[PDB]
Design a protein around this ligand. Structure first.
Ligand SMILES: Cn1c2ccccc2c2c3c(c4c5ccccc5n(CCC#N)c4c21)CNC3=O
Ligand SMILES: [Cl-]
Ligand SMILES: [Cl-]
Lengths: 308, 302
C-alpha cells in the first residue's frame, strides 16, 4: 500500500478540562470537554477516558481506536485532536462550537431551508460511506452525533468505531434502543446495513425538525413493534419519494436495505431539485447563526487553528 | 415538475385481522380483512396482499416499488392502498372491492347484464388506464380478472405487481422474460419482451373481449406457445355475438400488429363514451331492454 502519515498529538492532562459526562460505559466514559493550548482560543472537544488504568486488553483496544480515528480523514468525519497518556488513557475528539445538528434544527426549525436538509443527508451519507469503505461500523448514528461545523458543513463523531468478519458484537451499557436496527436489538450485532438503519432514523429526525423518535414509548415495546411492522410516520414535509428512502432503511432484512453509495447518489440527485422533493412553508425565504449549545461556551473551531 | 405529496401510511399488523382468503398466488396471497385504525373508532373493510417470502431483496424491492405506485396514483377507477406493513413479509392494505373481479362478476350474472353497463364499464377501464398513461406508468397485466367491482356502477383496476414505470428518456420498457399470461400480451411483448402503453391497449382489447363474451377464455382451445404463431398468422379473437361491427372493430384495432396504429386510451374513452350515449344501437343483447361499523374509501377523504 502507501504510508499512513497521520499525525498523532500528545496533549497534557492540564491542557484539557472535562465539563461533563456525555455517556458512560462498562469500560470507559465520555466527557464533554474544553481544550486550551498557550493560546487565547478555546476549543470544544469530546474526550474518551478508560475507566480502568490497568487492563492490557482494554489498553490495546483504546490505542487501536486512537489509531483508526487519527487514521480517518474525511470532511464529514470528526478529526482526532490527540491523545493523552495518563495511566487511564484519554482520547480527544473535536467537537463543533455551534453544536449538534439535532439541537440546531430544533432551534432553527422555523427558518430551516429545504436545500440544507437535502444537503445534510448527502453529507452524512458521505462520511458513512467513507467509514464503510474501510470496514468500519459506526454503531451509533443519530442527529445528536452529527455536528455542525457550519450550516453548510456537518461532521459525525467517530467515537467507539468498530472495525471488521461480516458482523461485530458490542456491549457498553446505556444502549440507544430507538435508533438501532431490530437485528441489533435482538442479538446485539452491528453491520453496515445496521448502520444504514440508524441512518434512516437520523434522516427522520432531521425531516421532522428534531421530534423524538417513537416518543413516549418504552424501550421493551420497541423490539416487538418493529416485528409487527410498525415504523416511524411520514414527516409532513416529506414527499413520498423521500419517505420511501427512509422506509427502505427500515426493512427488516439487512440486505434489502439500501447501501450507502446509493444513498449518496439519490440524495444528491434530489438535491439538484430540492423543492420538488421537499415542501416547507415559506421555503423560498428563510439565516446562518449561532446556536444555543454554542451560547453556553461563550468559541473557536478546531480545524481553523490547526491550519498553518 | 410538481412534488408528489401522496402519502403512504404504516400500520402495525395488530391493527388489522384477516377474516378470509380472496385469492392465491405464488408470489403470495390476498386476504379479506377488517382494519381498525388505532385511536379512530371505525371499521374499514380492506384487502391484504401478502407475499410467500421476505427472503429475496428483489421480492422486497418490487413490493416496495408496487406499494409506491398504488399510493401515488389517485383515480376513481384505480384502486388505492390505504397503507403498508413493514413486517418481515411486507403486507399491502388496499381498499376492498367486495364483489370481486369483473370477470368473475360477468359469468355469474350474464343473464342480467344490460348493454349500458358493458359500455359503461369499458369507459371506466379506459379512464383509469388513461390516467396511468398520464402518470408515465405501464400496467403490464390488464385482464378482466384484474378489474374489480366495488360496485356494478363503479369498477377499479388492480394488481400493479407487474407494473413498471417508464423513464422520461425512454419511450418503451423492455424486461427479461414474461411473468404474465401470453394471451393478454401484445405480440411485441411476447417476441421481444417489449412493453409500452400501446402494448397495454392490446391487453385492453382482450379485456373488452372478455366482457362482451361474458368471460370466455381467449384462444380458449390453444396452448400459450402456439399463440405467437397465430397472431403472426393473423388469426384473432372472434366476433362476440352480442357485438356489432362498430364495437368489435374497436377490439380489432387494439390487436393490430403495429403498436402505433392501435388506438390511444384517450381516444378509447371518447369512442366508448360516445357509444354509451346511445347504447342500444351499439350493443345487441336479448332482453336488453328489460335489463337495468361502516368504513369506506370515501370515509378517509375529508
Ligand atoms: C382476487 N381478488 C378478489 C377476489 C374477490 C373479491 C375481491 C378480490 C380482490 C381484491 C383485490 C385484489 C387485489 C389487489 C392487488 C393485487 C391482487 C388482487 N387481487 C387478486 C390478485 C392476486 N393475487 C384482488 C382481489 C383488491 N380488492 C379486492 O377486493
Ligand atoms: Cl452520546
Ligand atoms: Cl432510546
Amino acid at each position: 500500500e502507501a504510508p499512513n502519515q497521520a499525525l498523532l498529538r500528545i496533549l497534557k492532562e492540564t491542557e484539557f478540562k472535562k465539563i461533563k459526562v456525555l455517556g458512560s460505559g462498562a469500560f470507559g466514559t465520555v466527557y464533554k470537554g474544553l481544550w486550551i493550548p498557550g493560546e487565547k482560543v478555546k476549543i470544544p472537544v469530546a474526550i474518551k477516558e478508560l475507566r480502568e488504568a490497568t487492563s492490557p486488553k482494554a489498553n490495546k483496544e483504546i490505542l487501536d481506536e486512537a489509531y483508526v480515528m487519527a487514521s480517518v480523514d474525511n470532511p464529514h468525519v470528526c478529526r482526532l485532536l490527540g491523545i493523552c497518556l495518563t495511566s487511564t488513557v484519554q482520547l480527544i475528539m473535536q467537537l463543533m462550537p455551534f453544536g449538534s445538528l439535532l439541537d440546531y434544527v430544533r432551534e432553527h426549525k422555523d427558518n430551516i431551508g429545504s436545500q440544507y436538509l437535502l444537503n445534510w443527508c448527502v453529507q452524512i451519507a458521505k462520511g458513512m460511506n467513507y467509514l464503510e469503505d474501510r470496514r468500519l461500523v459506526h454503531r451509533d448514528l443519530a442527529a445528536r452525533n452529527v455536528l455542525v461545523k457550519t450550516p453548510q458543513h456537518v461532521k459525525i463523531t467517530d467515537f467507539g468505531l468498530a472495525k471488521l468478519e461480516k458482523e461485530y458484537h458490542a456491549e457498553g451499557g446505556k444502549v440507544p434502543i430507538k435508533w438501532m436496527a431490530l437485528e441489533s436489538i435482538l442479538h446485539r450485532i452491528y453491520t453496515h446495513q445496521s448502520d444504514v438503519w440508524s441512518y434512516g432514523v437520523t434522516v427522520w429526525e432531521l425531516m421532522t425538525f428534531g421530534s423524538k423518535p417513537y416518543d413516549g414509548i418504552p424501550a421493551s415495546e420497541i423490539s416487538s413493534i418493529l416485528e409487527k411492522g410498525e415504523r416511524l410516520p411520514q414527516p409532513p414535509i416529506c414527499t413520498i419519494d423521500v419517505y420511501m428512502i427512509m422506509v427502505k432503511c427500515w426493512m427488516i432484512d439487512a440486505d434489502s436495505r439500501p447501501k450507502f453509495r446509493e444513498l449518496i447518489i439519490e440524495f444528491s440527485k434530489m438535491a439538484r431539485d430540492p423543492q420538488r422533493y421537499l415542501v416547507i412553508q415559506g421555503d423560498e425565504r428563510m439565516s446562518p447563526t449561532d446556536s444555543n449549545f454554542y451560547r453556553a461556551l461563550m468559541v473557536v473551531d478546531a480545524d481553523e487553528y490547526l491550519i498553518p
